[PDB]
Each structure stands twice: as structure tokens, then as C-alpha cells.
Design a protein around this ligand. Sequence first.
Ligand code: GNP
Ligand code: CA
Ligand code: MG
Length: 146
Amino acid sequence: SVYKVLLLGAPGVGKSALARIFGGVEDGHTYDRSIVVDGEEASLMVYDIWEMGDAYVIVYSVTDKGSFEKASELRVQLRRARQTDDVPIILVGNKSDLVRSREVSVDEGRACAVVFDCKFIETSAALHHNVQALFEGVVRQIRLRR
Ligand SMILES: Nc1nc2c(ncn2[C@@H]2O[C@H](COP(=O)(O)OP(=O)(O)NP(=O)(O)O)[C@@H](O)[C@H]2O)c(=O)[nH]1
Ligand SMILES: [Ca+2]
Ligand SMILES: [Mg+2]
């Protein structure tokens, strides 16, 4: 048993980058990596679809507001097609390192996350920041809904 995680979002947001970083000196395009989350092992199968579904990860760039709105629409779309079996959905604002070209604030993303029933987190593939945390939250979010 593995946890299938799909990566969604607009082009160039850093979907391939995050998946690539997640794996990951081990031994299991799809990326497989076993990780210990809260003392409990869990195998993840990261799916970079654009290159079933236990969870969906919607990635957007904080330096591109267009990808942010596109994320909201995808979140709405997923909702209106998957019920119940409401698999956990995580909103990810990638490219947090680019603090000059940022068009979306941390609060703005966290706001739309909570109102649209999403898990929020900002990551930086370039800096390997919150990348781990993201996939640890995914596993932690998948469980929360047996
Ligand atoms: N500065 C910075 N650049 C990043 C970050 N994440 C990704 N990039 C850059 O953004 C570009 C797109 O990365 P990529 O992973 O291909 O995004 P993608 O979502 O796979 N794009 P596509 O839809 O074309 O497949 C690359 O040049 C990559 O180096 C980040 O956190 N910071
Ligand atoms: Ca691996
Ligand atoms: Mg790609």
C-alpha cells in the first residue's frame, strides 16, 4: 500500500522541482519515497501528472498571481467532482525565495486556503525549504481522514 499524491497547478510553478527534491536517497514519471511521519512509516508515490489519488497538491508561484487564481479554480473544480471521499487538498505557494517578485502574500494564500477548505504552506524548491514539511503534512492529512 502506497499513498498516491498528485501534483497540480499552472505551468512553471515548480511542480517537477518539488517532486524531484522529495526523492530522495532511497529506493521507492512517479516518485516513490518512504518517510517516517510521527513515528509511523508511510510510502509516498508522488505523481507529476503534467510530465488513484490519495491526495492532491496544488502548486502556485508567489511571484505569479495568475497561478494563484488558477489554483482556486482547480480547488473549486476538484470539490465539484469528488464527493464524498473528499481526499485532503494542500495549497502550496512555491518560490518563496524570490522575495522581490512576490505578488501573493503569505496571508492571502492562507486566507484562500482556509475558506476553500485547503491545507496551506509556502515552500522553496530552490532552497529546499518546507519541501519535506509539505509531504509530511500530506501524509499527516491523508490519515486524519480514514
Ligand atoms: N527561484 C526559484 N526558482 C524556482 C523554484 N522552484 C522552481 N523554480 C524554477 O522554476 C522553473 C520551473 O520549474 P518546474 O519544476 O519545471 O516547474 P513546472 O511546474 O514543472 N513547470 P511545467 O508545468 O513546465 O512542467 C525552473 O526554472 C525552476 O528552476 C523556487 O523555489 N525558486
Ligand atoms: Ca526515494
Ligand atoms: Mg514539469
